[PDB]
Design an enzyme around this catalytic site. Structure first.
Site, PDB file in Angstrom:
ATOM      1  N   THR A   1     -22.909   1.159  -1.746  1.00  0.00           N
ATOM      2  CA  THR A   1     -21.714   0.476  -1.263  1.00  0.00           C
ATOM      3  C   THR A   1     -21.926  -1.031  -1.349  1.00  0.00           C
ATOM      4  OG1 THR A   1     -20.387   0.084   0.780  1.00  0.00           O
ATOM      5  CG2 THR A   1     -22.589   0.979   1.057  1.00  0.00           C
TER       6      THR A   1
ATOM      7  N   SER B   1     -15.442  -1.698   5.249  1.00  0.00           N
ATOM      8  CA  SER B   1     -14.566  -1.212   4.184  1.00  0.00           C
ATOM      9  C   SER B   1     -13.108  -1.332   4.600  1.00  0.00           C
ATOM     10  CB  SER B   1     -14.883   0.247   3.857  1.00  0.00           C
ATOM     11  OG  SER B   1     -16.260   0.432   3.556  1.00  0.00           O
TER      12      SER B   1
ATOM     13  N   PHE C   1       6.790   8.829  11.802  1.00  0.00           N
ATOM     14  CA  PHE C   1       6.409   7.955  10.699  1.00  0.00           C
ATOM     15  C   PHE C   1       7.424   8.154   9.587  1.00  0.00           C
ATOM     16  CE2 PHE C   1       2.761   5.450   8.910  1.00  0.00           C
ATOM     17  CZ  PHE C   1       2.343   4.837  10.074  1.00  0.00           C
TER      18      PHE C   1
ATOM     19  N   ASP D   1     -13.133  -1.562  -8.409  1.00  0.00           N
ATOM     20  CA  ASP D   1     -14.395  -1.558  -9.145  1.00  0.00           C
ATOM     21  C   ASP D   1     -14.674  -0.204  -9.782  1.00  0.00           C
ATOM     22  OD1 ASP D   1     -14.657  -4.161  -8.377  1.00  0.00           O
ATOM     23  OD2 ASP D   1     -16.268  -3.795  -6.918  1.00  0.00           O
TER      24      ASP D   1
ATOM     25  N   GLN E   1       2.344   0.573  -4.356  1.00  0.00           N
ATOM     26  CA  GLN E   1       3.154   0.718  -3.151  1.00  0.00           C
ATOM     27  C   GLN E   1       3.280  -0.607  -2.420  1.00  0.00           C
ATOM     28  OE1 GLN E   1       2.234   3.041   0.805  1.00  0.00           O
ATOM     29  NE2 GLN E   1       3.904   4.022  -0.337  1.00  0.00           N
TER      30      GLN E   1
ATOM     31  N   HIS F   1       4.211  -1.916   0.934  1.00  0.00           N
ATOM     32  CA  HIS F   1       4.500  -1.593   2.317  1.00  0.00           C
ATOM     33  C   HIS F   1       5.652  -2.472   2.799  1.00  0.00           C
ATOM     34  CE1 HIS F   1       4.142  -1.039   6.633  1.00  0.00           C
ATOM     35  NE2 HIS F   1       3.240  -0.092   6.445  1.00  0.00           N
TER      36      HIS F   1
ATOM     37  N   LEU G   1      -1.031  -6.515   7.509  1.00  0.00           N
ATOM     38  CA  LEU G   1      -0.169  -5.362   7.705  1.00  0.00           C
ATOM     39  C   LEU G   1       0.324  -5.292   9.144  1.00  0.00           C
ATOM     40  CD1 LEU G   1       0.845  -2.530   6.650  1.00  0.00           C
ATOM     41  CD2 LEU G   1      -0.963  -1.654   8.161  1.00  0.00           C
TER      42      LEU G   1
ATOM     43  N   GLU H   1       3.769   0.579  10.153  1.00  0.00           N
ATOM     44  CA  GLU H   1       4.969   1.405  10.203  1.00  0.00           C
ATOM     45  C   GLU H   1       5.112   2.133  11.537  1.00  0.00           C
ATOM     46  OE1 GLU H   1       6.160   4.997   7.203  1.00  0.00           O
ATOM     47  OE2 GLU H   1       6.211   2.978   6.345  1.00  0.00           O
TER      48      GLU H   1
ATOM     49  N   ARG I   1       8.880   4.422   2.023  1.00  0.00           N
ATOM     50  CA  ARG I   1       8.513   3.017   1.871  1.00  0.00           C
ATOM     51  C   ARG I   1       9.107   2.397   0.614  1.00  0.00           C
ATOM     52  NH1 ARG I   1       2.160   3.222   3.716  1.00  0.00           N
ATOM     53  NH2 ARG I   1       2.593   3.201   5.975  1.00  0.00           N
TER      54      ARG I   1
ATOM     55  N   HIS J   1       0.259  -3.040  -1.093  1.00  0.00           N
ATOM     56  CA  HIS J   1      -0.472  -2.398  -0.008  1.00  0.00           C
ATOM     57  C   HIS J   1      -1.433  -1.305  -0.466  1.00  0.00           C
ATOM     58  CE1 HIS J   1      -1.172  -0.681   3.975  1.00  0.00           C
ATOM     59  NE2 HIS J   1      -0.756   0.491   3.522  1.00  0.00           N
TER      60      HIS J   1
ATOM     61  N   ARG K   1       3.631   7.175  -1.823  1.00  0.00           N
ATOM     62  CA  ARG K   1       2.884   7.783  -0.720  1.00  0.00           C
ATOM     63  C   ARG K   1       3.635   7.698   0.609  1.00  0.00           C
ATOM     64  NH1 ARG K   1      -0.532   6.100   3.185  1.00  0.00           N
ATOM     65  NH2 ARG K   1      -1.126   4.011   2.441  1.00  0.00           N
TER      66      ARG K   1
ATOM     67  N   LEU L   1      -5.292   8.213   4.904  1.00  0.00           N
ATOM     68  CA  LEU L   1      -6.470   8.564   5.693  1.00  0.00           C
ATOM     69  C   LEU L   1      -6.723  10.058   5.636  1.00  0.00           C
ATOM     70  CD1 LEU L   1      -5.990   6.369   8.917  1.00  0.00           C
ATOM     71  CD2 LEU L   1      -7.376   5.838   6.859  1.00  0.00           C
TER      72      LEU L   1
END
Ligand SMILES: *Cc1cc2c(cc1C)nc1c(=O)[nH]c(=O)nc-1n2C[C@H](O)[C@H](O)[C@H](O)COP(=O)(O)OP(=O)(O)OC[C@H]1O[C@@H](n2cnc3c(N)ncnc32)[C@H](O)[C@@H]1O
Ligand SMILES: CCCCCCCCCCCCCCCCCC(=O)OC[C@H](COP(=O)(O)OCCN)OC(=O)CCCCCCCCCCCCCCCCC
Ligand code: HEM
Ligand SMILES: CCCCCCCCCCCO[C@@H]1O[C@H](CO)[C@@H](O[C@H]2O[C@H](CO)[C@@H](O)[C@H](O)[C@H]2O)[C@H](O)[C@H]1O
Ligand SMILES: O=C([O-])CC(=O)C(=O)O
Ligand code: SF4
Ligand code: F3S
Ligand code: FES
Ligand SMILES: [K+]
Ligand SMILES: [K+]
EC number: 1.3.5.1
Lengths: 102, 139, 240, 611
Positions: free
Chosen positions: D38, D45, D120, D222, D241, D243, D253, D256, D287, D354, D398, D404
């Site tokens: 990493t 992250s 949501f 990457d 996307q 947002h 951000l 939402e 969105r 986003h 999405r 997530l």
């Protein structure tokens, strides 16, 4: 004990609180009882307190052992002399009053 | 695949033999009143202990007893403002340390940890130290 | 037409043999720069000195990457407003009393290893039900985690604490101790007594003398000092 | 000139966001000797910045059904989603969220003690007929923060070998199989080759191809670039996307979840305009639809602020205790980055880049695929998951709180698939003694680059170009000029200029490598965009306003001539780059419509898509 560290932390606060109660005691009931209690409480609190300073600032096995050994000597001599003063001289409470009459 | 103890060992092993510098700390960090008051609590504690220990040595080693030294000091007819200044100087560290010691014991009960309360209690400590010292030195 | 702000930034190159730490002053026009110190750092790197090296990622104060010492206090460069008093030069240092990898980048791996050492994860005595059903936790027991779980592990607090300066080899420091407490009071966790038992030594917890630099400095407004004092109370009252 | 260190593992995972962590210790938990490489300490992250939550049909707020969530996602993807992967993702969601709560994730809670879930965008009950769903599981508005810290905490229980602040440079390919990765140790400047039977790519997205994004500075595509440099295709990279609500100025951000708890979008005349653009879903439409509506209000003169260039997200009509309990993070962030007190005044917001729908194409098991003569073919030893992958569970748009989910479902899937296909300790494959030399040759060239265009200057030119030519609405001529400019920038990389000649923590060098990576992603994104002559999800062509499927699904299919594959657009883009020239080649592969089990979960045929 497996709880040596927390029991010691607790003992420190207790002796700090004890010493705090001895200051009214010295003003209000000066005498041999308070004099020797101050001897005991002042030595134990200062010894544990100086031990925390050593633990914070002295590093290395040998310098640590040396500082703590010298601290034991300092504390043992301090308690002995305060008991000496209380027995052979006017004692802590009277000495303070005499100092303050200057 | 390394335990925490091995990671700490390797950290110290790696860095102490490296040419990396230690970033500055005490020389560059901004002070606050609680920070100044915290170390003054330590410095008055140590000074009080050294004073108690020197007094204890004097009881074991000096050829005269306490009433003689009190009588001697009176024979110098020191000025009242100079007597008052010595009394104030003597009682100030005890006073500071006692009041702030009370503040510490309140913290050990879990109270007064909001930063704004840490500041309030410090200033409260300072004014009590001043009042009690001035009052005691006038006795 | 422009507002030249001066920054004095700590520099050290490990790839220059015999290089000694030094301060380097840069001049930034605040009119052509975002409001935060990281904005100035990025502008300097992109426009004046691409050798200036620092850690960053989220630029909104959630990842914890950019912790440094700005004007004498540990903070996140990305949420620390630039001081617009042009008569003051802002000094920027790495997190204090840390080994410097390069410029403003400190070695945090001891800090991470201390975090690993407290087992910062849920532990149940019977874990054979792991993954069948959600564990129940009341709104009231979940509220006990507020002020604790929000930590971003930036190490601002721990590297502001003088006890960690002098004994960071053995004192866990405020960030790790507050996470230890976060797991001690998680009502789902079954290892409270074992987590307290780990701190029964002169150093792990008890180098804290309530200086309270940690709470002052926390970019998240948390109170690691208070959490440490609750631990101390639990240490003194738990049985076996 | 560079000392190379060789490693052998069963499995190497590149990335330590939510997907890489879940993949990495799932592998160790399955008995595999696993490295995790990493470029960031894992909790830095971009996953740490995630806010609104993670979807799963737990039924904690009302009776739910994972098949309703499946339906929502398929409709959300605008039928560019592979429905087998969506079936897998949405059926696995309850178990996956429960796995996280059992790890210690401090979910907000209901009166019954269960995970609190909020509404949501684009989620419904009864296959679109039953009203607003409440299945977004959350930790206030800090869900990603807790998800990553919980996953990282959990990873410490296993023997995974972490290589932290190592920058992966390229894949090690031999005869179409991945043999591992080569990487740069940033701490000491050493080159490392990680040999492994299986390599998992979980390197996140590339929002930083644009000038304004919610993404971390470290979202530089990457792993996507590495796939591209391997001669492999990326998929659907034109689907970016926006947002709806990045804060004006900084671009941070604003979840939402603000709209899911009651917040509304208003314009300069106080109108809750989403009631006009999406009469049913309003501020909780998809969105791509909200972002498009916001954009239209601004360019049609109803934008807010002194420049008339944003709109308002209003939360202050909501009880302040709900704001404090449900939205503390954006409450503090709105004050810091906009001086806004959310209990009194609205937040200035505008659509902000986003999330990348596209990425490395995989099957529903996590295996990277290539596509040759009309046949998907697994790339042996290579996996991808999370935002870097194109499974494709998101297709053309999405749903919020599905990423997530993707992270932990498909991170785990990669582990499960390797475990059912390989055994630990199987002979790690050999690589030629000079494997990866070209990666080092490139790195050295940048490290000493002394041209006329410094890195920051080329990166800005890329970002402004993407911003002006590949935005919420697109057209052919503007995309073509964006293509021409971007190819010019790519050629101008020959004139690159670096200054830091070190190798230890040379972020000047590391950020030039990231620019090479971003450029390969951007070149595929915009050339894909220019060639996709249709409107689908987040890709809106004002010169091609209709969705173009194999039938006109607005009318009865009875008696329709199916359009040939070459004459419609319900197909994934596959993109290749000749890294030497920067030339982009495109091909296409069908969308998967079958589920994992037709009797358990019906395939959903394409339909009119309205909110
Ligand atoms: C930007 C964003 C996204 C987001 C969100 C809020 C913000 C501000 N809130 C979300 C939410 O509430 N619910 C949801 O479903 N999604 C939300 N998102 C989207 C989502 O957070 C992201 O798509 C997702 O977290 C991506 O996770 P993933 O595990 O795929 O990747 P990452 O967290 O970005 O981490 C990338 C990792 O890869 C490593 N890396 C990258 N390059 C290299 C190289 N060259 N070498 C080695 N490692 C590399 C990074 O170190 C990082 O660990
Ligand atoms: C530091 C030096 C000690 C300072 C103590 C200040 C208190 C002095 C004082 O006010 O004591 C007076 C008290 C009564 O005597 P008088 O003043 O005549 O008043 C009669 C009507 N109240 O006389 C008394 O009854 C004395 C009662 C108080 C005894 C105090 C015991 C604790 C002292 C610890 C001091 C340790 C530090 C020593 C450092 C210097 C050492 C050289
Ligand atoms: C006469 C006294 C002497 C000679 C003395 C000496 C000391 C010393 C040497 C320390 C150690 C300083 C440190 O570790 O930072 C200390 C600490 C302390 N003292 Fe005293 N002290 C006296 C009176 C008092 C009184 C009256 C109170 C009430 C008190 C409360 C405390 C407390 C609470 C601490 C602990 C500070 C901490 O844990 O950080 N002391 N004292
Ligand atoms: C025995 C006597 C021992 C104690 C007295 C010694 C003298 C103390 C000197 C240290 C005081 O130093 C001063 O402290 C104050 C109050 O904490 C700090 O102020 C702090 O709080 C204020 C108000 O909340 C903030 O505006 C400010 O940004 C912050 O730094 C100030 O930055 C520091 O410069
Ligand atoms: O992207 C998502 O899935 C959710 C997100 O950014 C938000 O919290 O609004
Ligand atoms: S308690 Fe605050 S200062 Fe300390 S690591 Fe956590 S967020 Fe950073
Ligand atoms: S500054 Fe350090 S001494 Fe304790 S209260 Fe904070 S950890
Ligand atoms: S860059 Fe993430 S905390 Fe500042
Ligand atoms: K517990
Ligand atoms: K993707």
């Amino acid at each position: 004990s497996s709880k040596a560290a927390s029991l010691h932390w607790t003992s420190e606060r207790a002796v700090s609180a004890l010493l705090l109660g001895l200051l009214p005691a010295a003003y209000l009931y000066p005498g041999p009882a308070v004099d020797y209690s101050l001897a005991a409480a002042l030595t134990l609190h200062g010894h544990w307190g100086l031990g925390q300073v050593i633990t914070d600032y002295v590093h290395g096995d040998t310098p640590i052992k040396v500082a703590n050994t010298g601290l034991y000597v300092l504390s043992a001599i301090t308690f002995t002399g305060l008991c000496y003063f209380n027995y052979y001289d006017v004692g802590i409470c009277k000495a303070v009053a005499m100092l303050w009459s200057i | 695949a390394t335990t925490a103890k091995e990671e700490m060992a390797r950290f110290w092993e790696k860095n102490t033999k490296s040419s990396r510098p230690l970033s500055p700390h005490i020389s560059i960090y901004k002070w606050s009143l609680p920070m100044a008051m915290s170390i003054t609590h330590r410095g008055t504690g140590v000074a009080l202990s050294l004073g108690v220990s020197l007094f204890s040595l004097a009881a074991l080693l000096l050829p005269e007893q306490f009433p003689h030294y009190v009588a001697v000091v009176k024979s110098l007819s020191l000025s009242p403002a100079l007597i008052y200044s010595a009394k104030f100087a003597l009682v100030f560290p005890l006073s500071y340390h006692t009041w702030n010691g009370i503040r510490h014991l309140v913290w050990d009960m879990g109270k007064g940890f909001k930063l704004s309360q840490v500041e309030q209690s410090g200033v409260v400590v300072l004014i009590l130290t001043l009042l009690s010292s001035a009052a005691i030195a006038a006795m | 037409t422009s507002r030249i702000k001066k920054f004095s930034i700590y520099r050290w190159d490990p790839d220059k043999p015999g290089d000694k730490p030094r301060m380097q002053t840069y001049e930034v026009d605040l009119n052509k720069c975002g409001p935060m110190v990281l904005d100035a750092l990025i502008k300097i790197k992109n426009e004046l000195d691409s050798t200036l090296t620092f850690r960053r990622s989220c630029r909104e104060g959630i990842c914890g990457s950019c912790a440094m010492n700005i004007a004498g206090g540990n903070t996140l460069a990305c949420t620390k407003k630039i001081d617009p008093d042009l008569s003051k030069t802002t000094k920027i240092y790495p997190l204090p009393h840390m080994y410097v990898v390069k410029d403003l980048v400190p070695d945090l791996s001891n800090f991470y290893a201390q975090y690993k050492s407290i087992e910062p994860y849920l532990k149940k005595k019977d874990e054979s039900k792991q993954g069948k059903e959600q564990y129940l936790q009341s709104i009231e027991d979940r509220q006990k985690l507020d002020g604790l779980y929000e930590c971003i592990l930036c190490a601002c607090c721990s590297t502001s604490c003088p006890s960690y300066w002098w004994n960071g080899d053995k004192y866990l420091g405020p960030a790790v101790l507050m996470q230890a407490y976060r797991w001690m009071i998680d009502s789902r966790d079954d290892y409270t007594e074992e987590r307290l038992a780990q701190l029964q030594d002169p150093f792990s917890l008890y180098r804290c003398h309530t200086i309270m630099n940690c709470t002052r400095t926390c970019p998240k407004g948390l109170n690691p000092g208070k959490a440490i004092a609750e631990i101390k109370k639990m240490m003194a009252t738990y049985k076996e | 000139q560079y000392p190379v260190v060789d490693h052998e593992f069963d499995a190497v995972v590149v990335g330590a966001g939510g997907a890489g962590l879940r993949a990495a210790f799932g592998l160790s938990e399955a008995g595999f000797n696993t490295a995790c490489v990493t470029k960031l300490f894992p909790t830095r992250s971009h996953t740490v910045a995630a806010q609104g939550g993670i979807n799963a049909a737990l039924g904690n707020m009302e009776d739910d059904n994972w098949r309703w969530h499946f339906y929502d996602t398929v409709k959300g993807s605008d039928w560019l989603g592979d429905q087998d992967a969506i079936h897998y993702m949405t059926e696995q969601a309850p178990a996956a969220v429960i796995e996280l709560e059992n790890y210690g994730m401090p979910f907000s809670r209901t009166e019954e003690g269960k995970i609190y879930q909020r509404a949501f965008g684009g989620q419904s009950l009864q296959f679109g007929k039953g009203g607003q769903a409440h299945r977004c599981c959350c930790v206030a508005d800090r869900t990603g923060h807790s998800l990553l810290h919980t996953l990282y905490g959990r990873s410490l229980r296993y023997d995974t070998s972490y290589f932290v602040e190592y920058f992966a440079l390229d894949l090690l390919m031999e005869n179409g199989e991945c043999r591992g990765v080569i990487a740069l140790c940033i701490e000491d400047g050493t080159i490392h080759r990680f040999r492994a039977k299986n390599t998992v790519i979980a390197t996140g997205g590339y929002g930083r191809t644009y000038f304004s994004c919610t993404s971390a500075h470290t979202s530089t595509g990457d792993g996507t670039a590495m796939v591209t440099r391997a001669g492999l295709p990326c998929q659907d990279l034109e689907f970016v996307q926006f947002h709806p609500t990045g804060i004006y100025g900084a671009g941070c951000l604003i979840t939402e979840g603000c709209r899911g708890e009651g917040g509304i979008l208003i314009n300069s005349q106080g109108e809750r305009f989403m009631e006009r653009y999406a009469p049913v879903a309003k501020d909780l439409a998809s969105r791509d639809v909200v972002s498009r509506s916001m954009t239209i209000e601004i360019r049609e003169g109803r934008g807010c602020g002194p420049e008339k260039d944003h709109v308002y997200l209003q939360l202050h009509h909501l009880p302040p205790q709900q704001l404090a309990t449900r939205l503390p993070g954006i409450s503090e962030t709105a004050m810091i980055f906009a001086g806004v007190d959310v209990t009194k005044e609205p937040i200035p917001v505008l659509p902000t880049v986003h999330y990348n729908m596209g990425g490395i194409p995989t099957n529903y098991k996590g295996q990277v695929i290539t596509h040759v003569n009309g046949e998907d073919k697994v790339v042996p030893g290579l996996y991808a998951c999370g935002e870097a992958a194109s499974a494709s569970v998101h297709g053309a748009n999405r749903l919020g709180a599905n990423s997530l989910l993707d992270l932990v479902v498909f991170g785990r899937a990669c582990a499960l698939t390797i475990a059912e296909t390989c055994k630990p300790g199987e002979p790690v494959p050999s690589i030629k003694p000079n494997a990866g030399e070209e990666s080092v040759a490139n790195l050295d060239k940048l490290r000493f680059a002394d041209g006329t265009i410094r890195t920051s200057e080329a990166r800005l030119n890329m970002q402004k170009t993407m911003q002006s030519h590949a935005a919420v609405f697109r057209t052919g001529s503007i995309l073509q000029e964006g293509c021409e400019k971007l190819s010019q920038i790519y050629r101008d990389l020959a004139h690159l200029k670096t200054f830091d000649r070190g190798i230890v923590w040379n972020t000047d060098l590391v950020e030039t490598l990231e620019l090479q990576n971003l450029m390969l992603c951007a070149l595929q994104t915009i050339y894909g965009a220019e060639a996709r002559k249709e409107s689908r999800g987040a890709h809106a062509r004002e010169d091609y306003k209709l969705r173009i499927d194999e039938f006109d699904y607005s009318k009865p299919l009875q008696g329709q001539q199916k359009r040939p594959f070459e004459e419609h657009w319900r197909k994934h883009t596959l993109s290749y780059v000749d890294v030497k020239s920067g030339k982009v080649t495109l091909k296409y592969r069908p969308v998967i419509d079958r589920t994992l089990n037709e009797e358990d979960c019906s395939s959903v045929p394409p339909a009119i898509r309205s909110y």
